Design a protein around this ligand. Sequence first.
Ligand SMILES: Cc1cc2nc3c(=O)[nH]c(=O)nc-3n(C[C@H](O)[C@H](O)[C@H](O)COP(=O)(O)OP(=O)(O)OC[C@H]3O[C@@H](n4cnc5c(N)ncnc54)[C@H](O)[C@@H]3O)c2cc1C
Length: 378
Amino acid sequence: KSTKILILGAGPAGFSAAKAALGKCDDITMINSEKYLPYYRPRLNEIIAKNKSIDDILIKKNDWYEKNNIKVITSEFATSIDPNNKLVTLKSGEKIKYEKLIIASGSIANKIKVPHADEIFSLYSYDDALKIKDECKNKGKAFIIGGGILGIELAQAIIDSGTPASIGIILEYPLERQLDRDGGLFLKDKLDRLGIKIYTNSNFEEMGDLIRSSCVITAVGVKPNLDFIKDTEIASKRGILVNDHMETSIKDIYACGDVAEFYGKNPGLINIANKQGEVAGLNACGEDASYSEIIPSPILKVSGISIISCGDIENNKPSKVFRSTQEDKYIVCMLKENKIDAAAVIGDVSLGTKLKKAIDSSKSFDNISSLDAILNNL
Ligand SMILES: Cc1cc2nc3c(=O)[nH]c(=O)nc-3n(C[C@H](O)[C@H](O)[C@H](O)COP(=O)(O)OP(=O)(O)OC[C@H]3O[C@@H](n4cnc5c(N)ncnc54)[C@H](O)[C@@H]3O)c2cc1C
């Protein structure tokens, strides 16, 4: 088999490339390791929370790919790329020739060892969600290891489905990449009075009884899924390195979405997948579109508590810090001279957005004597 445009991976990024290539190129093939068409992966929590199926989260149904003549090979996994012969080798041993290759292979969950746990689950795929659904009914409760957004959202989804759940983290407070200590503890409190318990400073060896009796899910982050490039000269660091055209180190090979690293950024967000996938498809069909960095992200969809975080909060060495704790909201604002370098707000997206804009536009503040004076100049 041989095609014009070969798309390696059929998630949101791959889908967006196919859609972009439509009308412009007339021979498009998508390879996907899963047995499902491209689906809106961030809604996996709804499979758990609302008992929705794959059909409810698919981006396009079968008929769309047929009407548009896009060929999807499901349950097939690329293992090798031969760039000079333009051949991709699959798990079966079958080879596919391409004129252009778009790598859209997304991410893979970080795997950690958890003491006392026979089976460790993580939530990446639709099949993952189902496995979690069933163990939660089987065990009767869940224990989520990992201090991030996804771990918290999953806990609520599992609560919503009708199963108790709590979280275990190794640090003192959750969300340490997005929040300072006081921010995280503010969040922990709000989550704890909402029935989402977080075990802090955990030693999992000492949590045998809970671990044993729970469905254990690790939510410890994700990395670009790119082992199949190992023998090639395709440049990578964390992700596959791409320019603004989504072109890799190697001619006629592109990458986009979760697998791709653009000016050192690999944020792992769906709007980036959609937009990078689009640019890749367009370029693969000979239209020299440029991706520009977009990215805001209002987190998180959890327990009706909203968070926006901007800049390097975790390791910030600011000249000045302004903090506000209220009943409904938490604000932290970190200065570098007369500029806001980093900020996070819990419970006021309107304010977080103003701080975001100030940071992004690099607004200078001639008055830094008080938080009030900064707020008035946003
Ligand atoms: C539970 C969960 C919640 C999320 N919530 C949010 C959110 O709120 N906001 C947000 O912005 N993002 C969220 N995300 C992330 C979002 O889903 C991703 O950014 C987006 O799916 C990336 O799309 P992608 O096409 O680059 O990668 P993927 O969605 O991972 O798709 C890549 C596809 O390629 C396949 N593949 C991998 N290797 C091969 C290979 N060797 N050969 C052939 N096929 C291969 C994979 O099976 C996969 O189907 C969430 C993710 C998860 C898992």
